[PDB]
Design a protein around this ligand. Structure first.
Ligand code: HEM
Ligand code: K
Length: 249
């Protein structure tokens, strides 16, 4: 259902150059997970009913999120601001989604297709809000399904975004990485989830909910056994997330 807008050749040129600059920057700064989180969270504010929120530049520097969990995203946007300034023609909305795509790529994940043309909207993110690490499967379907309009498969695949990065007790309160290789995009989120709790590693109640649900669980097993399949489903889900409300909601 996507009809992508036309952008000028100068715009496409900036996209390509920004993509390369983002690779080097994100790799050097070791901030892929924070950038993936910024992109996903920004896109994830979409609500299909009201057609509000989505990946439209609504969280930017200087951010004021202040609430538990969302802290850290202020750091992400500040980190990106000097580079963004080198590409004034790009919308913030496109720039942040491009950074999320690059974050997945430079850590070794799939190549998520990217289409430019998101407009920076006025304005802000209403919150309040939804995504709660202490809740379960019903809550997940409320957030991704009822609000965002994604499928059950997308929910499991996107949860695998936790295969890179960590929680911080000063940010959400949770603490530590999901995996032993938190800068490597692979299927280890699912293998660690299956094998139970382990010293040094984190599982949110929202991660654990995937294990108890009749639809989610077989997908967890599938992804833990077949990284290629995870990569395919992840690339599909990430593209959809990144394009919520955009080029036909
Ligand atoms: C399913 C609902 C989700 C919940 C409840 C949730 C919750 C959280 C929490 C509590 C943290 C820790 C924040 C901190 O303390 O620093 C976190 C981090 C993170 N999230 Fe999620 N998340 C969800 C979905 C997603 C999705 C869909 C993606 C991307 C596809 C994602 C990517 C990440 C990444 C990469 C980090 C690590 C950030 C870092 O290393 O600084 N999350 N998430
Ligand atoms: K990993």
């Amino acid at each position: 259902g996507k009809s992508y807008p036309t952008v000028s050749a100068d715009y496409q040129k900036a996209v390509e150059k920004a993509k390369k600059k983002l690779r080097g920057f994100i790799a050097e700064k070791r901030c892929a997970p924070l950038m993936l989180r910024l992109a996903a969270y920004s896109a994830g504010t979409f609500d299909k009913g009201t057609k509000t929120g989505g990946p439209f530049g609504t969280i930017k520097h200087p951010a004021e999120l202040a609430h538990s969990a969302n802290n850290g995203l202020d750091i992400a946007v500040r980190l990106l601001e000097p580079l963004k300034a080198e590409f004034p023609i790009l919308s913030y909305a496109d720039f942040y989604q491009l950074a999320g795509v690059v974050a997945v790529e430079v850590t070794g994940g799939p190549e998520v297709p990217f289409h430019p043309g998101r407009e920076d909207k006025p304005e802000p993110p209403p919150e309040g809000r939804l995504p709660d690490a202490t809740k379960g499967s019903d809550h997940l379907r409320d957030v991704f399904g009822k609000a965002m309009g994604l499928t059950d498969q997308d929910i499991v695949a996107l949860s695998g975004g936790h295969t890179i990065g960590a929680a911080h007790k000063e940010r959400s309160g949770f603490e530590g990485p999901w995996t032993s290789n938190p800068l490597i995009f692979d299927n280890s989120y699912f293998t660690e989830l299956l094998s139970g709790e382990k010293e040094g590693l984190l599982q949110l109640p929202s991660d654990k909910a995937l294990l108890s649900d009749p639809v989610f669980r077989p997908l967890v097993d599938k992804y833990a056994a077949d990284e290629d399949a995870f990569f395919a489903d992840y690339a599909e889900a990430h593209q959809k997330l990144s394009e919520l409300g955009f080029a036909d909601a």
